[PDB]
Paper text:
These Aβ monomers tend to aggregate into insoluble fibrils, the structure of which has been extensively studied in vitro by cryogenic-electron microscopy (cryo-EM) and solid-state nuclear magnetic resonance spectroscopy, revealing a spectrum of different polymorphs. Two human fibril polymorphs have been determined: ‘type I filaments’, which are mostly associated with sporadic Alzheimer’s disease (SAD), and ‘type II filaments’, which are observed in familial Alzheimer’s disease (FAD) and other neurodegenerative disorders with amyloid brain pathology. Here, we determined the structures of nine ex vivo Aβ fibrils from six different mouse models by cryogenic-electron microscopy.
The residues V12–A42 form the ordered core of all three murine type II fibrils. Type II fibrils are made of two S-shaped protofilaments, which are related by a C2 symmetry in all three models. Each monomeric subunit is stabilized by two hydrophobic clusters around residues L17, V18, F20, V24, N27, I31 and L34, and residues A30, I32, M35, V40 and A42. Strong, localized densities can be observed close to K16 in murine type III, DI1, DI2, DI3 and murine type II Aβ fibrils. For example, when the APP23 line was used to assess treatment with the murine parent antibody of aducanumab, a reduction of total plaque area and improvement in spatial memory was seen. Furthermore, [11C]PiB also works effectively in the ARTE10, tg-APPSwe and APP23 mouse models, which all show an Aβ fibril fold similar to human type II filaments as long as the mice exhibit high total brain Aβ levels.
Residue numbers in the entry:
A (entry chain B), B (entry chain D), C (entry chain F), D (entry chain H), E (entry chain J), F (entry chain A), ...: 12 to 42
Write the structure that this text describes.
Amino acid sequence: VHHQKLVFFAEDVGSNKGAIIGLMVGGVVIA
Amino acid sequence: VHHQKLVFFAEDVGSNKGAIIGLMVGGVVIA
Amino acid sequence: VHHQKLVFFAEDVGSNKGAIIGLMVGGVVIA
Amino acid sequence: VHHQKLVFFAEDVGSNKGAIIGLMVGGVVIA
Amino acid sequence: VHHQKLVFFAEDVGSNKGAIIGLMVGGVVIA
Amino acid sequence: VHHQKLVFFAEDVGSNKGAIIGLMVGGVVIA
Amino acid sequence: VHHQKLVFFAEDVGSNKGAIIGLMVGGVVIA
Amino acid sequence: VHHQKLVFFAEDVGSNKGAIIGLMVGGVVIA
Amino acid sequence: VHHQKLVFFAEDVGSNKGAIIGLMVGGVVIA
Amino acid sequence: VHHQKLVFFAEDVGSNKGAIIGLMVGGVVIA
C-alpha cells in the first residue's frame, strides 16, 4: 500500500468553506 | 504503508474558512 | 508506517480562518 | 512510526486566524 | 516513535492571530 | 413605506458562510 | 421611509464567516 | 429617511470571521 | 437623514476576527 | 445629517482581532 497525492489542486483555489480531506477511516462528515 | 502528500496545493490558496485535513482516523467533521 | 507531508502548500496561502490539520486520531472538528 | 513534515508551507502565509495543528490525539477543535 | 518538523513554514509568515500547535494530546482548541 | 424585520431569526443560527441581506437595491449577489 | 431592524437575530449566532448586511444600495456581494 | 438598528443581535455572537455591515452605499464586498 | 444604532449587539460578542462596519460609502471590503 | 452610535456593543466584547469601524468614506478594508 502506497498512498500519494490523494487530492491534487494543480491551480489556485479561490476559497474553501467546506471540508477537504485526503483520506478518512471513520465517517460522519457533514458539509 | 507509506503516506505522502495526501492533500496537495500546487498553486496559491486564496483563503480557508473550512477544514483541510490530510488524514483522519476518527470522524464527526462538521464543515 | 511512515507519514510525510500529509498537507502540502506549494504556493502562498492568503489567509487561514478555519482549521488546517495534518493528522488526527480523535474527531469532533467544527469548521 | 516516523512522522515528518505533517503540515508543510512551501511559500509565505499571509495571516493565520484559525488553527494550524500538525498532529492531534484528542479532539474538540473549533475553528 | 520519532516526531520531527510537524508544522513547517518554508517562507515568511505575515502574522499569526490564531493557534499554531505542533502536537497536542488533549483537546478543546478554540480558534 | 415602512420596512421592519425584513429577515428574522427567532432561534439560534449555527453558522453563516453565505450572505444574509435585509434589503438590496442593486444586484450581482454571488453565493 | 423608516427602516428598522432589517436583519434580526433573536437568539445566539454560533459564528459568522460570510457577510451580514442590513441594507445595501450598490452590489457585487460575493459570499 | 430614518435608519435605526439595521442589524440587530438580541443574543450573544460566538465569533465573527466575515463582514458585518449595517449600511453600504458602494459595493465589492468579498466574504 | 438620521442614522442611529446601525449595528447593534444586545449581548456579549465572543471575538471578532473580521470586519464590523456601521456605515460605508466606498467599497472593496475583504473579509 | 446626524450620525450617532453607528456601532453599538451593549455587553462585553471578549476580544478584537479584526477591524471595528464606525464610519468610513474610503475603502480597501482587509479583514
